[PDB]
Amino acid sequence: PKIKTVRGAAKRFKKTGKGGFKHKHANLRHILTKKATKRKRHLRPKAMVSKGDLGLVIACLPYA
Amino acid sequence: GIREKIKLVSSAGTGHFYTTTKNKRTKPEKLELKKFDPVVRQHVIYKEAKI
Amino acid sequence: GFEGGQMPLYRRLPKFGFTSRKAAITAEVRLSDLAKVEGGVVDLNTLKAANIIGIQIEFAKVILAGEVTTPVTVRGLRVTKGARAAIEAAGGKIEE
Amino acid sequence: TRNGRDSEAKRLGVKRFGGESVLAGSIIVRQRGTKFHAGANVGCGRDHTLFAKADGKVKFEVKGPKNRKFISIEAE
RNA sequence: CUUUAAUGUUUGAUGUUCUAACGUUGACCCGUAAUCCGGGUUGCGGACAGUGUCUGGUGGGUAGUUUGACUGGGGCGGUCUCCUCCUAAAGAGUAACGGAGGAGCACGAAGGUUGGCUAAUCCUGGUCGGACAUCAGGAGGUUAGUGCAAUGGCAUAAGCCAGCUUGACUGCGAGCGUGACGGCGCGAGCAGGUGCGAAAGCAGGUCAUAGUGAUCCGGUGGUUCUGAAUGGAAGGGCCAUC
RNA sequence: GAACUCGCUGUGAAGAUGCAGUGUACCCGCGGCAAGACGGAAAGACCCCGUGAACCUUUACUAUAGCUUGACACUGAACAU
RNA sequence: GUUUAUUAAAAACACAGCACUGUGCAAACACGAAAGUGGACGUAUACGGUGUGACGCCUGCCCGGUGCCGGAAGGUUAAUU
RNA sequence: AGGACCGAACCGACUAAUGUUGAAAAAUUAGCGGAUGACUUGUGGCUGGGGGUGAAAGGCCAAUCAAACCGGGAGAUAGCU
RNA sequence: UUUUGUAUAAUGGGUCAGCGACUUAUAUUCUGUAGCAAGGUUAACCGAAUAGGGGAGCCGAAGGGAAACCGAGUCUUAACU
Ligand SMILES: [Mg+2]
Ligand SMILES: [Mg+2]
Ligand SMILES: [Mg+2]
Ligand SMILES: [Mg+2]
Ligand SMILES: [Mg+2]
Ligand SMILES: [Mg+2]
Ligand SMILES: [Mg+2]
Ligand SMILES: [Mg+2]
Ligand SMILES: [Mg+2]
Ligand SMILES: [Mg+2]
Ligand SMILES: [Mg+2]
Ligand SMILES: [Mg+2]
Ligand SMILES: [Mg+2]
Ligand SMILES: [Mg+2]
Ligand SMILES: [Mg+2]
Ligand SMILES: [Mg+2]
Ligand SMILES: [Mg+2]
Ligand SMILES: [Mg+2]
Ligand SMILES: [Mg+2]
Ligand SMILES: [Mg+2]
Ligand SMILES: [Mg+2]
Ligand SMILES: [Mg+2]
Ligand SMILES: [Mg+2]
Ligand SMILES: [Mg+2]
Ligand SMILES: [Mg+2]
Ligand SMILES: [Mg+2]
Ligand SMILES: [Mg+2]
Ligand SMILES: [Mg+2]
Ligand SMILES: [Mg+2]
Ligand SMILES: [Mg+2]
Ligand SMILES: [Mg+2]
Ligand SMILES: [Mg+2]
Ligand SMILES: [Mg+2]
Ligand SMILES: [Mg+2]
Ligand SMILES: [Mg+2]
Ligand SMILES: [Mg+2]
Ligand SMILES: [Mg+2]
Ligand SMILES: [Mg+2]
Ligand SMILES: [Mg+2]
Ligand SMILES: [Mg+2]
Ligand SMILES: [Mg+2]
Ligand SMILES: [Mg+2]
Ligand SMILES: [Mg+2]
Ligand SMILES: [Mg+2]
Ligand SMILES: [Mg+2]
Ligand SMILES: [Mg+2]
Ligand SMILES: [Mg+2]
Ligand SMILES: [Mg+2]
Ligand SMILES: [Mg+2]
Ligand SMILES: [Mg+2]
Ligand SMILES: [Mg+2]
Ligand SMILES: [Mg+2]
Ligand SMILES: [Mg+2]
C-alpha cells in the first residue's frame, strides 16, 4: 500500500529550495543562566542538515 | 551549589530582566546595577527579585 | 531511523512552528496564466472556470512571472508592485 | 587497582609554519601560556591563541633581551 | 463589637415505641396422589438485616513481568562522565583490571580601568620577647606568589596596594580550529548605548586548561502572530527563564 | 565419501595406514583375543552465551477475586433529649 | 500398616495419645456468578484447622523485633456538600 | 479373644545371577514379606486439566505429566545453526 | 562447510532415479529507452468496441518566514558595510 510518513520527523525538518532540510538547534530549552550570551546568540537561527545525515532523513520523509 | 539564582528586574517598566546567582548568607544586601535595557535602548537601574 | 541504540537524529532535535489553515485557501497567479481567461476580466470566478486555481481557494495574488501582452482588467485580487508596472505597460488596469 | 583514568587530548601545537600564506583571522598556534609571543599583525586570544590580523606570510624570529620567540605576518 | 435567656426558623445526631415495606431453613390449610414451588391464616423479627452504584483499608489466594555491561572462563571484588602528567617512538592522534593525582565549585569583588609597588631565606643590633612576633642595617636574586590538583606560562608582571566604577552590555560577524554526527572553541571589524584616563587607548567576566545533562512534558513573564459561522475568549506559536 | 587398508622416528590445525626418511613384507581363507581405527549407539544433561522459556518464593513492581468502612437507593410513623 | 507402576521401602508418611485455636445452628468451613449441596437427618462428652507423636520422668528465662487479640481521649484522613 | 504365632492358595517385591538388536517396551530362576484384616477380589457408578485425586514420592489421571490428548490463532517469533 | 589457520583424528553425505529454496501485489527513488514538451497525463464511469468520450484530480513552471504577510526576493534587527 502507500508508504507511511514518520509523523515525528515531519515536526522537525522542512525542505528548502534545492532539496536540503533545515532544523532547529539544540541546547536552547533549559539551563540558560550558566550559558554565555555569545553561545546562546549563535543557537537562535536555523541550520542545514549535514551530508552524513541526509540519507537517514530522506528515508523518514518519503512525501516531503 | 549553595549559591542560588535570582533575577534583576528593570525599573523602566518594560518587563525585561537579567539572571545571575548569589549567596544569601554572607551578602543580604539587595543587588543594584546599571545595565542596558534593549526595549527602551537606555542604561537604567535594575533591582533584585525572585526567579 | 534505527542506529543501534544511540538516540536518533529525529528525536534529539526540537520541534517548532504551527500549521496555518489560511494558507490552504490562498493561491498565486502568474502573468502568463493571465491571458487564458474568457472575456479579458481577470476575476476569482473567471480563474476557476479556466482551471487556474482550485475551487476551495478564496484569496489570490498576481506575481511577476512570465509575460503579459493583451490588455486585461484585474478586479478584486492582490498585485505586487512588479506585476502592477507590467500590467499597466500593456494597457490594462487594476481596480480593487 | 586505584589507577585507571585519564582525559581527552586537546590537539594543541603549530597549525601554520614558516612561509605560509594565510588570510586575516586564521589561527597560527594553540598553546597553554605564551610560549610564543605576538609580533606584528598578530593578536593574542583569551586562551593564549595567536591569530592573524592581516594577510601575508608567517614568520618566526627571536628578539629582545630574553631571547624569546615571536610570530609576525609579512603583508603583501 | 463582649458574653448572655428566650418567640419562632433550617437542621444534624442519640435513644424509646409502633407496623405498613422487607425477612422467616416456626405451626396449620389448599393446588395434590408431592419433605420442590406457589397462594392463604397465624406467631416471631422489623425499618434492622440483606442487596445495586460509588468510595478509604487489607489482600503472593490469583495474574503479567523485571532483576545492566566490562572481565586473560563465569561468580566475589573493582570500574562506568569530566581535568593534568608519563607510556606515546622531537607535527596531530594512539591500547591494557598499565604507573601517579584531582573535579560535580567560588567571587558584586577575587570583574573593568587609572596611578603606584616588588619576593623566600640567612646574618648582626635591639624592653618585656624566648628557635620563631614588631624595629633597624647587610647578604641573596624569585630558591617567593597565583582562590582549589598537575602542566605550560607570568617583571611591560598574569603577583601586591589604593581612587572611580558595572563591558559579568544589546544586535551581528570576514575568517579559522576540532569532531561520524548532535555539538564545542577562537576571533579582528560594524551599529546603538556606557565606564575609566589629560590623551594615545582599554573593557562582550576571572593567568589558561575540570566545576556538567539531549529531546519529550509541564510552570512563570512579555508579545505588529493565529483564533473552525462572525466579535471576543480558551488553546497554540515566537522571545526570556525554571 | 571412496580404497590397491604394514612398523619406527620426525613433521603437521600441536597424539598419522595414507606426508618425509627408512626398515620389513609371495596370493587367499578358518578358529580365537580385544591394543588402535580420537570404534558404534543420543545436534553434551557439566560450563558459558541469547535484551530465549517454564514452574516456585517474598516486606521486588503493577493490578485483581475475596473480606472490611462510610454516603445514596429499596425505606416508613410518632416521642423525648 | 503406607510410599517414588518402570534404578531409592528407609531413620521418610500414617497412627493411637497430647496441646493450642475457631464454631450457639440458617454453626464455623468447603464446591458454586446463583439457586442449591456436603458438614449432619449431627448440636460444645459435637464439628473444623494447626503442631507434636505409645509409655515413664519432665517441659526452665525473654513480649525488645515480626504476627495476632483488646481499647479510643487526641492528631491525620475518602466518596459527599 | 487377638490390626496374636508358623505356613499353602491369594496379594506383594528385599538380595543375587541371566537377559539387555530379550521368550518379555520391566520378565525368568533360587531364596524373601503379609496371609481374619487399616485384608483381597468381580460387576456397575461419581470426581476433568491451572482441574481432579493423593496414609505426601511433585506421586497417578489409557506404554504421555513441575501442568493430559485432539483441533484451531498458525507459515507464532528465532540479532542463532 | 566453518574458520587466523584443516590430509586432518572438526561437521555432512551408503548409492541411483524423481522432487526441493530471492517470489507476487501495492507505493517511492535512481538508470536505460520511447512519446509529447512550458507542459505531461487521466481514475471511477459510459461505450459491443484493447477505438472513442470522461481533465474530477496529480506532478512541474517561485521562493522566503513559526505565522499574518511580502514576492526575484524574503527573513533577521532600531537599521545593516
Ligand atoms: Mg522556551
Ligand atoms: Mg501532494
Ligand atoms: Mg541506553
Ligand atoms: Mg480543477
Ligand atoms: Mg587507560
Ligand atoms: Mg590517550
Ligand atoms: Mg619563518
Ligand atoms: Mg421465625
Ligand atoms: Mg430445599
Ligand atoms: Mg416485634
Ligand atoms: Mg420493631
Ligand atoms: Mg447495610
Ligand atoms: Mg508466589
Ligand atoms: Mg507470581
Ligand atoms: Mg508477553
Ligand atoms: Mg557478562
Ligand atoms: Mg574472574
Ligand atoms: Mg586464562
Ligand atoms: Mg581466555
Ligand atoms: Mg587480554
Ligand atoms: Mg580480556
Ligand atoms: Mg553468569
Ligand atoms: Mg565479576
Ligand atoms: Mg559485582
Ligand atoms: Mg606526539
Ligand atoms: Mg612521534
Ligand atoms: Mg612532539
Ligand atoms: Mg591506528
Ligand atoms: Mg586500537
Ligand atoms: Mg600598572
Ligand atoms: Mg603553577
Ligand atoms: Mg587550579
Ligand atoms: Mg599568575
Ligand atoms: Mg588584575
Ligand atoms: Mg572622560
Ligand atoms: Mg575561571
Ligand atoms: Mg584573579
Ligand atoms: Mg583559575
Ligand atoms: Mg582544567
Ligand atoms: Mg593541555
Ligand atoms: Mg470565532
Ligand atoms: Mg493567549
Ligand atoms: Mg583402490
Ligand atoms: Mg583393501
Ligand atoms: Mg598388511
Ligand atoms: Mg606404516
Ligand atoms: Mg604408527
Ligand atoms: Mg608420531
Ligand atoms: Mg595418499
Ligand atoms: Mg609416507
Ligand atoms: Mg610431498
Ligand atoms: Mg614413507
Ligand atoms: Mg617420495
Ligand SMILES: [Mg+2]
Ligand atoms: Mg581353507
Ligand SMILES: [Mg+2]
Ligand atoms: Mg581371513
Ligand SMILES: [Mg+2]
Ligand atoms: Mg579370523
Ligand SMILES: [Mg+2]
Ligand atoms: Mg580393540
Ligand SMILES: [Mg+2]
Ligand atoms: Mg588406523
Ligand SMILES: [Mg+2]
Ligand atoms: Mg564414538
Ligand SMILES: [Mg+2]
Ligand atoms: Mg545428547
Ligand SMILES: [Mg+2]
Ligand atoms: Mg544456560
Ligand SMILES: [Mg+2]
Ligand atoms: Mg544483548
Ligand SMILES: [Mg+2]
Ligand atoms: Mg429517601
Ligand SMILES: [Mg+2]
Ligand atoms: Mg494404595
Ligand SMILES: [Mg+2]
Ligand atoms: Mg507399590
Ligand SMILES: [Mg+2]
Ligand atoms: Mg521404583
Ligand SMILES: [Mg+2]
Ligand atoms: Mg533406621
Ligand SMILES: [Mg+2]
Ligand atoms: Mg513418605
Ligand SMILES: [Mg+2]
Ligand atoms: Mg475450645
